[PDB]
């Protein structure tokens, strides 16, 4: 990324198409980042994950309590 | 007895040692009996001093020899068995103070007591 | 995140490349901030990958729980 | 104020998919200004060729003819700097002294000691003393270290009275990235716990300058053309315990023994008199700063912990005590029998000479430093005024040279209490006293004197006397 290209330029000009490859790598990284899906900050993502964890815990507790009260004939 | 702890507290703080006279006159009835004046301090202050000249306090004696009871100082520094102690350092300060003391002249006692002053001499 | 983190990383890379080109064509604080931003972008990308994995796991768990709850409800 | 000119308008004017023609068409065209290219070790991970390239760039910038067979390995062309970690002068050395310190993750002691030793070997000599005399002195400055190590090994009693105290012997290897060592300081105070030596690994009967405090002595000079040897001769084992320094032979060596004095400790005229009779003239030719020695030395020693806030103590040393608060003084501006004030030697002139008659040149300095430490102990960081209780102020009166005394009105008795505290030996100070025919018995026996000696602290000793002797 930044440090890789910087070190390459430093080691090359200390005394071919490196910029083309760097731009290609940056475009690939941008495409991979956009392919992920998470556009908004991970704050809301973590909030929704905590909410889903709470919901899963509630569902597990309900399923457990359902198998406890067994007083039928 | 209070005079000893008084002059201790005096030394205990870095007074100007000339404003010290104010505190001395205040702590005392100012004329009751000056036979308990700085006369004895020179002894007692040096008592525990021993092999040390104990500076920063002789300044009090210096600011006192201007006008004080020279007779008591004389007789007490005469009776002081300090050469027997053989400190060889304090005796030097004694010579220095006696220089300023006796070189010019003694003072008047306004009574026959001054004659006894001569005796101390 | 992923989008904002990748954008910040690309901007930091462009800034560092421009600064290196200017330094090479011509002859402290900005470099430190650039490195801090790059490290933050990398940490954010790692956190985004971890969060995507955890979100996939939680989605599978929620699907299983919803199927079990639907069977029990039926 | 803002940073909107970093990624908003820079990428559009950075002069893409067809904008990489800047390697052959636009190429028709730093030390401390442009550090981007210089700080290659920060943009990338610390590797072997990275630092090897940075060193080569710095050498080509400063000017130093050096090269190797290829890129990946290169030594240092000097007297003995040739060393591979992990013959035109000295022989091929492969000791750990230059391989142990840089074993796994060293990144600090690689660009300071080397440049320091390189700059040290500089003088008006042109191929006659810049290299010849430098290597001669570097070789000669090893027989003394060998003899010190042999004497330390011979003194197989304890590493407390012979290694630190008594004499020299707390030395380390003097080669390349490390000079000679010695226990100049005589710290009798431990850490925040017991004085456990050998922290995790230290067992070589050497005690290098890492465990606690120890000076760094070297041998360099520029105009000190003094008559002395030019090679190390005294290296053989003595008959039983040790031997003197037999020379021969003797030439005009243009160097000296300038050590690294950390703190400018004030010394006495006796030290200068002894130094002006060891190698001709004294070890310093400048105006003697005859200012208050103890006063300035205490402040210099305590200036380590001091923050940017001013002190303005003015001979005030209020501090704590075993169960209360107290005060202290320094008897400054008090003309002793010596006449003038104590002469000050607050300088870094540590330019000693060959190991001649210097068997006690450190013991006197050790005692002086210990007295200074005992004096300055009362004032390190304690700031507490208007203390109604206690405040047992006392003034350390250094009447005789290296002989102090403190008189205070101890509450044990209704009078003053003086005690002679003279530095007789280097670690065994004299704590005797002279009482009076008519005085209270607030003075303890030699037991309290030895306790104060073992304590080696002015306020601690004062509190002990006020507590142990009183006992009421």
* Residue D354 to residue D362: CA distance in whole angstroms: 14
In a mutagenesis test of the C interface, which of A26, A40, A42 is the best target, namely the one with the most C β-carbons within 10 Å? A42
Residue D243 in tokens: 């031997």
Q: What is the CB-side half-sphere exposure of residue D357 using CA atoms within 13 A?
A: 8
Residue with tokens 């004197």: D449
Residue C62 in tokens: 């929620």
Q: Is B76 helix (H, G, I), strand (E, B) or coil?
A: helix
Torsion angle of the four alpha carbons D52, D54, D60, D61, in this order, in degrees rounded to the nearest 10: -160
Closest CA to D329 of D340, D319, D339: D319
A35 secondary structure, DSSP code: T
Q: What is the CB-side half-sphere exposure of residue D453 using CA atoms within 13 A?
A: 19
Experimental method: cryo-EM
User: Could you write out the three-class secondary structure of D228-290?
Assistant: ECCCCCCCCCCCCCCCCCCCCCCEEEECCEECECCCCCCCCHHHHHHHCCCCCCCCCCCCCCC
* Residue B100 to residue D308: CA distance in whole angstroms: 48
**Any CB–CB contact under 8 A between A10 and chain D?**
yes
Number of helices (H), then strands (E), belonging to chain A: the values are 3, 0
* DSSP per position, D210-234: TSS--EEE----SS-EEEE-SS---
C/D interface, count of CB pairs below 8 Å? 37
The distance from CA B25 to its chain's CA centroid, rounded to whole angstroms, is 16
E-assigned strand segments in D36-128? none
Name D406's bridge partners.
Answer: D396, D419
Neighbours of D383 (CB within 10 A): 11
**Any CB–CB contact under 8 A between D67 and chain A?**
no
* Residue D435 to residue B51: CA distance in whole angstroms: 9
Residue D288 in tokens: 């003697």
Residue D6 phi/psi, 5° resolution? Answer: -115, -50
* Residue A5 to residue D43: CA distance in whole angstroms: 10
User: Do C32 and A70 contact (CB within 8 A), yes or no?
Assistant: no
- Residue D398 burial class via C-beta count within 10 angstroms: exposed 0-12, middle 13-18, buried 19 and up: buried
The nearest CA of chain D is from the CA of C67 a distance in Å of 49
Q: Do C23 and D37 touch (CB under 8 A)?
A: yes
Closest CA to A8 of D40, D338, D102, D185: D40
User: Do A3 and C38 contact (CB within 8 A), yes or no?
Assistant: yes
Report chain C's terminal Cα–Cα distance, integer Å. Answer: 40
B and D adjacent (3 or more CB pairs under 8 angstroms):
yes
Closest CA to D464 of D402, D410, D383: D410
Helix, strand and coil in chain B, % to nearest 5: 60, 0, 40
Closest CA to B77 of B34, B36, B46, B35: B46
- Largest Cα separation within chain D, whole Å, is 106
* DSSP per position, chain C: --HHHHHHHHHHHHHHHHHHHHHHHH---HHHHHHHHHHHHHHHHHHHHHHHHHHHHHHHHHHHHHHHHHHHH-
User: Do D186 and D176 contact (CB within 8 A), yes or no?
Assistant: no
The nearest CA of chain D is from the CA of A47 a distance in Å of 31
User: Do D335 and D341 contact (CB within 8 A), yes or no?
Assistant: yes
D and A adjacent (3 or more CB pairs under 8 angstroms):
yes
- Contact list, D418 vs chain B (CB under 8 Å): 48-50, 52
Q: Is D329 helix (H, G, I), strand (E, B) or coil?
A: strand
Which pairs from B108-117 meet CB under 8 Å and 24+ separation? B109/B71, B113/B71, B114/B71, B116/B71, B117/B70, B117/B71, B117/B74
Q: State the Cα angle at D65 between D59 and D66, rounded to 5°.
A: 80
Torsion angle of the four alpha carbons D465, D160, D178, D305, in this order, in degrees rounded to the nearest 10: -10
Q: Do B50 and D417 touch (CB under 8 A)?
A: no
C18, C26, C30 ranked by CB distance to D11: nearest: C18
- Contact list, D37 vs chain C (CB under 8 Å): 20, 23-24
The nearest CA of chain C is from the CA of A42 a distance in Å of 5
* Residue B18 to residue B64: CA distance in whole angstroms: 9
* Residue D47 to residue A48: CA distance in whole angstroms: 43
User: Do D399 and D405 contact (CB within 8 A), yes or no?
Assistant: yes
Closest CA to D120 of D283, D259, D285: D259
Closest CA to D83 of D146, D173, D171, D177: D177
Element (DSSP H or E) covering residue B1: none
Closest CA to D37 of A13, C14, A22, C10: A13
In a mutagenesis test of the D interface, which of A20, A21, A27, A30 is the best target, namely the one with the most D β-carbons within 10 Å? A20
Q: Do D11 and C20 touch (CB under 8 A)?
A: no
Buried b (16+ CB within 10 A) or exposed e, A5-34: bbbebbeeeeeeeebeebbeebeebeeebe
* Residue D345 to residue D266: CA distance in whole angstroms: 4
Element (DSSP H or E) covering residue D393: none
Closest residue in C to D23 (Cα) is C21
Residue B4 phi/psi, 5° resolution? Answer: -70, -50
* Residue D2 to residue B46: CA distance in whole angstroms: 74
* Residue A51 to residue A45: CA distance in whole angstroms: 10
Residue D318 in tokens: 């209020």
- Alpha-carbon distance values, D103 to D74, D107, D175, D180, D198 (Å): 17, 10, 17, 22, 21
Q: Do D415 and B48 touch (CB under 8 A)?
A: yes
* Residue D4 to residue B106: CA distance in whole angstroms: 91
User: Do A60 and C72 contact (CB within 8 A), yes or no?
Assistant: no
* DSSP per position, D334-363: ---TTSSPPPP--S---EE-SSSS-SSHHH
Beta strands D319-321; D251-254: pairing state: unpaired
Q: Is D419 helix (H, G, I), strand (E, B) or coil?
A: strand
* Residue D61 to residue D77: CA distance in whole angstroms: 17
- Contact list, A13 vs chain C (CB under 8 Å): 24
Rg for chain D, CA atoms, rounded: 29
Residue D455 phi/psi, 5° resolution? Answer: -70, -45
């Amino acid at each position: 990324f930044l440090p890789l290209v910087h070190n390459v330029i430093k080691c090359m000009d200390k005394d071919q198409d490196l910029n083309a490859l760097k731009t290609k790598f940056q475009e690939l990284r941008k495409l991979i980042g956009t392919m992920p899906g998470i556009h908004v900050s991970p704050e809301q993502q973590q909030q929704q994950l905590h909410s889903l964890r709470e919901q899963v815990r509630t569902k597990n507790e309900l399923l457990q309590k359902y198998k406890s009260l067994c007083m039928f004939e | 007895v209070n005079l000893k702890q008084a002059i201790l507290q005096a030394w205990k703080e870095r007074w100007s040692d000339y404003q010290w006279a104010i505190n001395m006159k205040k702590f005392f009835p100012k004329g009751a009996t000056w036979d308990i004046l700085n006369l004895a301090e020179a002894l007692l202050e040096q008592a525990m001093i021993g092999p040390s000249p104990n500076p920063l306090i002789l300044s009090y004696l210096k600011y006192a020899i201007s006008s004080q009871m020279v007779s008591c100082s004389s007789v007490l520094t005469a009776i002081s068995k300090f050469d027997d102690f053989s400190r060889d350092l304090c005796v030097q300060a004694l010579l220095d103070i006696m220089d300023m003391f006796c070189d010019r002249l003694s003072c008047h006692g306004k009574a026959e007591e001054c004659i006894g002053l001569c005796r101390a001499l | 995140t992923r989008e904002r983190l990748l954008s910040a990383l690309e901007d930091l890379e462009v800034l560092s490349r421009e600064l290196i080109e200017m330094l090479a064509i011509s002859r402290e604080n900005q470099v430190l901030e650039l490195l801090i931003h790059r490290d933050g972008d990398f940490q954010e990308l790692m956190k985004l990958a971890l969060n995507q994995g955890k979100v996939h796991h939680e989605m599978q768990a929620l699907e299983k729980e919803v199927e079990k709850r639907d069977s029990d409800i039926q | 104020l803002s940073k909107m000119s970093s990624l908003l308008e820079r990428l559009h004017a950075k002069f893409w998919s067809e904008t990489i023609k800047l390697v052959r068409q636009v190429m028709e065209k730093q030390h401390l200004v442009s550090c981007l290219e210089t700080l290659q070790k920060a943009l990338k991970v610390t590797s072997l060729p990275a630092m090897t390239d940075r060193l080569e760039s710095i050498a080509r910038q400063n000017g130093l003819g050096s090269h190797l067979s290829a890129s990946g390995t290169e030594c240092y062309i000097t007297s003995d700097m040739f060393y591979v970690e992990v013959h035109h002068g000295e022989n091929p050395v492969s000791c750990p002294e230059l391989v142990q310190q840089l074993r796994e993750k060293n990144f600090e002691e690689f660009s300071k000691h080397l440049k320091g030793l390189v700059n040290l070997y500089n003088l008006p000599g042109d191929n006659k003393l810049k290299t010849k005399m430098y290597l001669a002195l570097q070789s000669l400055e090893q027989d003394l270290s060998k003899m010190a190590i042999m004497y330390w090994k011979a003194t197989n009693a304890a590493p407390l009275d012979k290694i630190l105290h008594g004499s020299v012997g707390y030395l380390t290897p003097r080669s390349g990235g490390h000079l000679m060592n010695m226990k100049y300081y005589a710290s009798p105070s431990d850490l925040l716990d017991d004085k456990t030596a050998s922290p995790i690994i230290l067992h070589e009967k050497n005690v290098p300058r890492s465990l606690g405090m120890n000076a760094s002595v070297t041998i360099e000079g520029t105009s000190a053309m003094y008559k002395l040897p030019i090679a190390p001769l005294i290296m053989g084992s003595h008959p039983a315990d040790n031997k003197w320094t037999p020379s021969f032979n003797s030439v005009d060596l243009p160097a000296c023994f300038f050590l690294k004095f950390p703190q400018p400790i004030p010394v006495s005229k006796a030290f200068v008199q002894k130094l002006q009779n060891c190698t001709g003239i004294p070890l310093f030719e400048t105006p003697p700063t005859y200012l208050p020695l103890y006063e300035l030395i205490t402040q210099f020693e305590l200036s380590k912990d001091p923050d940017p806030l001013p002190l303005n103590h003015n001979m005030r040393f209020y501090a704590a005590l075993p169960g209360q608060q107290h005060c202290y003084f320094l008897n400054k501006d008090a003309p002793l029998p010596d006449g003038q004030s104590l002469q000050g030697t607050l300088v870094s002139k540590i330019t000693f000479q060959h190991p001649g008659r210097v068997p006690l040149i450190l013991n006197m300095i050790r005692h002086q430093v210990a007295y200074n430490t005992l004096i300055g102990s009362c004032v390190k960081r304690t700031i507490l005024k208007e203390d109604s209780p206690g405040l047992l102020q006392f003034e350390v009166c250094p009447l005789s040279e290296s002989r102090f005394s403190v008189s205070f009105q101890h509450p044990v008795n209704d009078s003053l209490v003086c005690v002679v505290m003279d530095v007789q030996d280097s670690t065994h100070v004299s704590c005797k006293l002279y009482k009076g025919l008519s005085d209270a018995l607030i003075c303890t026996d030699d037991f309290i004197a030895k306790v104060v000696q073992r304590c080696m602290s002015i306020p601690v000793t004062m509190r002990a006397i006020r507590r142990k002797a009183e006992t009421i």
